[PDB]
Amino acid sequence: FGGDAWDQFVKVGGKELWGKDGLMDSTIRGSETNVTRLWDDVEGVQYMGE
Amino acid sequence: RVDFGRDAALTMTTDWTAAGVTLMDMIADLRDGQRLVSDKSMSGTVIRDYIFGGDAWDQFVKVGGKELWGKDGLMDSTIRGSETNVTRLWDDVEGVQYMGELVGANGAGRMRIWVNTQKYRDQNDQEQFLMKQKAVMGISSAIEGVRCFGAI
Amino acid sequence: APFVAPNVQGRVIKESGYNTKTFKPAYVKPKHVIDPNMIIPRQPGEALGTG
Amino acid sequence: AGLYTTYQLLEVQRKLKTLPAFFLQWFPRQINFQEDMIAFDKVIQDVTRV
Amino acid sequence: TSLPNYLAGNGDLGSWEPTQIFAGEADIVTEGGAAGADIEIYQVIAKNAAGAMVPHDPTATEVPAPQSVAIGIAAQPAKSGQNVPYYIGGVFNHAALGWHASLDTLAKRQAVFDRTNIHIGNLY
C-alpha cells in the first residue's frame, strides 16, 4: 500500500475491520487475519500482517 | 535564550477541542510528531515515550475515552489487532505517573504514556506546572542530554 | 543517480557541509543572611513557656 | 578567553540517510550481458484440452 | 562559510590586555534592575525618569534630567527591557569603565562619583 491508499483503507474499512463480526473478531473462527491497528510512522516500509 | 537549535517544525500545534476529533485523529497527531522526530533526529530514533500535560491528558480522555475501552475499541481482548494496556483508572497526584502502553500488535507502534502535573515555584514565586499542561511532549533517550557544569 | 547517455562526460555532484553548536552554561548564586531576629524566635519543636 | 574562547569538542553527530532496498527483493536474478539487447520468448501451452 | 585561503600572509590571533576593574578594597556592592536602553559591560549607567537603567548622560535636560546622575557600573551587558546587574559600591579603575563623551579626564570622572559609595581612581 501507498500511505494515502492505506489511510483511505483504514478510514473506510477500519470500522468493519477490527469490528464486531469483523475479520478480526476472535469470537468468530472464520479467519486468522492479524492486521495491526497501530503502527510506527517511520519513513520506510511497514508490515501490517495478513 | 540558550537555544539548542531544535527544528522549529517540532513545536507543533493542533486543536483537540475542535469539532469531530476522535481517538485516531489524536494518535495521528502524536504520530505526526513521531514521524518528524524520526526524520529530523541524527540517530533516526523512534519516540517510544510520550509525556502528557494534565490538561492534554484530560482532553485526551474526554475525546477518545469512548473509542478507547469501547467495544470495537482499541482495548478489547476479543479483537486481536492490538496489545494496548492503558488503564481505565489512575491515581491523581502532583507528580508523574505511568498510564500504560498504547501498543500495536507485535510490539509495533507502541507509545508509552506518561502524565506529568508536577509543579515548581517560579522566579516570581508563583507556583507553576513543570510540564506544559496543555501539550504533549514526545521524548527518547536518544536526546542523550548532557548536564553541564562550568567552573565555579 | 543521473541517467547520462554513454557518449557524454557525466554529471558533477555537489557535496554539503557540517554545522556546529556551541553552549555556555548559566550561573546560579543564592544566599541567605542569618540575623539574630531569625535565630532568636522559637523553632516549632520547642516547648511552650521556657523554649 | 581573551584571545579565543576555549572549547570542548563532544562527539560528532553523523546522520547518514539511506534508501534501503525493498523492491529489489523481487529482482533476485542478475544478468551481465554485453549484447545490444535482451530478449524473451514467452510460450502459452493450453494442455487443458480433452 | 567554507572556502580556504591560499595566499600567504602574516597571521595574528589578536591581543589580550587584562581589564583591571578594581583599584582598591572598598567593599563591593551589587544590585540589579530593568534596563531602559542598550547597556555594555562596565558602562556607567544612570536611572532614567522611569527608574530603568540607562547609560549615563551628563547635560541631559531646563532642569537636568535624571539620566544625568551616575548611579552604578553595569556588570554585564543587556538590551532594553532586560535586567542589568550593576555595581553600586567599590573602588574602580577610571580607565576600565565605559564613559560618556566630554567626560574624559580623571578629574571629571571622579567628579561624577564623590557623593557615593563608588570611588574611581588610577592604577599605579
DSSP state of B112: E
Please count the residue pairs, one from chain A and one from chain D, whose beta carbons lie less than 8 angstroms apart: 3
3-state secondary structure chain D: CCCCCCCCCCCCCCCCCCCCCCHHHHCCCCCCCCCCCCCCCCCCCCCCCC
Closest approach of E20 to chain D, Cα-based (Å): 13
Contact D10 B42 (CB under 8 A): no
Query: How would you classify the pairing of strands E83-93 and B49-53?
Result: unpaired
Q: For residue D14, which residues of chain B lie inside 8 Å, CB to CB?
A: 42
Contact D15 B41 (CB under 8 A): yes
- Give the Cβ contact number of residue B27 at 10 Å: 22
Collect all residues from A whose CB is shorter than 8 A from any CB in B. 15, 17-20, 22, 24-27, 34-43, 46-47, 49
Nearest to B137 by CA among B30, B15, B4, B21: B30
Query: What residues form DSSP beta bridges with E87?
Result: E30, E73
Q: For residue D3, which residues of chain E lie inside 8 Å, CB to CB?
A: 13-16
C-alpha distance from residue A24 to each of A8, A31, B85, B118 (Å): 19, 7, 19, 41
Buried b (16+ CB within 10 A) or exposed e, B55-89: ebbbbbbebbeebbbeebbbbbeebbbbbbebeee
**Domain range annotation of chain E:** 29-121
Q: Got the DSSP string for B62-95? A: HHHTTTTTSTTSSS-TTBTT------S-----SS
Nearest to E40 by CA among E86, E102, E108: E86
Q: What are φ and ψ of residue C17, in 5° steps? A: -110, 155
Describe the crossing of helices B23-40 and B54-64 by its angle, rounded to 10 degrees.
130
Q: Which of residues 25-44 of C touch B (CB under 8 A)?
A: 25-27
Residue B11 CA, chain-centre distance (Å), reads 13
Closest approach of D9 to chain E, Cα-based (Å): 19
Single-letter amino acid, residue E12: D
User: C-alpha cell of B104?
Assistant: 500495536
Q: Which residue of B has its CA nearest to C20?
A: B5
CATH number 3.40.50.920 is the correct assignment for the domain at E29-121: no
Contact B43 D15 (CB under 8 A): yes
User: C-alpha cell of B10?
Assistant: 517540532
Q: For residue E12, which residues of chain D lie inside 8 Å, CB to CB?
A: none
With 0-12 / 13-18 / 19 or more C-beta atoms within 10 angstroms meaning exposed / middle / buried, residue E59 is exposed
Please state how this structure was obtained. Answer: cryo-EM
Reported resolution, Å: 3.3
Contact B108 A26 (CB under 8 A): no
CB B14 within 8 A of CB B29: yes
Question: Given a contact as 3+ CB pairs under 8 Å, which chains touch D?
Answer: A, B, E
Q: For residue E15, which residues of chain D lie inside 8 Å, CB to CB?
A: 3
